[PDB]
Amino acid sequence: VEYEVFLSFRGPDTREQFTDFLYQSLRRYKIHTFRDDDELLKGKEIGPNLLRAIDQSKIYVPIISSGYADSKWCLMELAEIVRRQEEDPRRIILPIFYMVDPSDVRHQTGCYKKAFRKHANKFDGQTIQNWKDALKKVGDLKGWHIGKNDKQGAIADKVSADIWSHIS
Amino acid sequence: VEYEVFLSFRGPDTREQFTDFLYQSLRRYKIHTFRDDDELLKGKEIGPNLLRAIDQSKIYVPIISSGYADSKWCLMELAEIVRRQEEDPRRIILPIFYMVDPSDVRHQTGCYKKAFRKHANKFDGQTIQNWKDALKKVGDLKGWHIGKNDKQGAIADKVSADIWSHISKE
Numbered sequence: 001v002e003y004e005v006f007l008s009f010r011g012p013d014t015r016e017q018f019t020d021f022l023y024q025s026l027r028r029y030k031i032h033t034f035r036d037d038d039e040l041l042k043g044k045e046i047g048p049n050l051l052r053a054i055d056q057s058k059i060y061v062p063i064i065s066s067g068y069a070d071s072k073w074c075l076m077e078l079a080e081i082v083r084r085q086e087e088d089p090r091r092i093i094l095p096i097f098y099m100v101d102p103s104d105v106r107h108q109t110g111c112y113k114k115a116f117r118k119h120a121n122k123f124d125g126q127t128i129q130n131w132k133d134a135l136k137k138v139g140d141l142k143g144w145h146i147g148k149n150d151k152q153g154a155i156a157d158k159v160s161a162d163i164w165s166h167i168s
Numbered sequence: 169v170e171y172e173v174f175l176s177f178r179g180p181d182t183r184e185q186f187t188d189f190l191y192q193s194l195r196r197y198k199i200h201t202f203r204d205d206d207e208l209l210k211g212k213e214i215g216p217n218l219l220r221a222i223d224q225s226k227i228y229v230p231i232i233s234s235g236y237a238d239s240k241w242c243l244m245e246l247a248e249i250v251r252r253q254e255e256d257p258r259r260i261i262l263p264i265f266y267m268v269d270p271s272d273v274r275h276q277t278g279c280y281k282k283a284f285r286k287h288a289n290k291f292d293g294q295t296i297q298n299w300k301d302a303l304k305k306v307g308d309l310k311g312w313h314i315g316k317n318d319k320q321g322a323i324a325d326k327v328s329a330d331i332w333s334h335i336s337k338e
């Protein structure tokens with residue numbers, strides 16, 4: 001019933017690949033997991049699911065792909081994920097760097113440059129900054145890189161086992 | 169006065185780069201840290217240091233560079249580190265992927281192919297395989313990647329802080 005793990009991801013990048021594989025593995029462990037899909041969430045899920053999940057989950061998994069900063073929902077959620085961990089350092093953030101160099105996540109360079117250029121047309125400096133600070137923070141945490149040669153199912157198994165053993 | 173952190177690394181690859189910076193940061197926290205350099209150990213240091221440190225340290229940091237598997241000492245030590253954490257999983261292993269794809273560490277491909285080709289001239293299959301299994305096990309753990317665009321002092325600082333939090337929570 002109570003949520004344990006919170007997946008933050010860019011739908012179009014990973015919803016069918018790693019994110020889904022990780023979701024499946026977590027269920028095999030009966031870990032109650034929320035999928036923060038930036039495109040497919042429903043209106044009656046905001047309260048009963050989203051806020052509760054983000055409130056209850058003690059483990060957050062940002063699956064950060066090349067299109068992650070293109071989505072304002074992703075950035076908004078990462079910032080909130082970061083804030084909540086800072087309030088309650090017992091909470092853990094476990095980044096997955098999906099087919100991006102962690103350097104680009106850390107400095108918002110490469111594929112992320114144009115996202116932030118775009119957002120700066122609509123949002124103020126403090127909002128943009130908060131979003132960059134969250135990517136830097138999380139980009140600097142230990143995690144798993146996923147590259148073109150990885151067996152994503154094996155990584156998913158490693159990640160879910162690690163999560164399961166901690167949850168005890 | 170026990171060792172707390174055990175650094176495993178390929179000397180010629182990282183001695184002057186990230187390994188030193190992490191050592192310096194750890195030292196700023198006054199964290200007692202052993203440098204398992206594959207070239208510069210002394211014999212009086214095998215007992216009262218190396219073995220003491222590998223025994224006492226509850227955090228192992230394998231800094232895995234492209235020349236890591238070229239060194240039999242590195243491979244041997246990784247296998248030991250991996251054996252010790254399985255024996256006592258309060259211990260943790262924190263891999264640094266220094267200018268290598270984690271993919272390659274995980275599957276011992278790319279730069280690591282020829283290394284294992286060469287060791288197979290002198291060691292039997294069981295021995296080679298135990299070494300491959302160590303790299304795979306460690307390559308599959310959460311850790312930090314370092315690339316050419318990274319500011320390694322920044323990363324050293326973040327690893328130090330993480331290590332420090334963990335030591336303190338105990």
Ligand SMILES: [Co+2]
Nearest residue numbers: 169198199200
């Ligand atoms: Co001390």
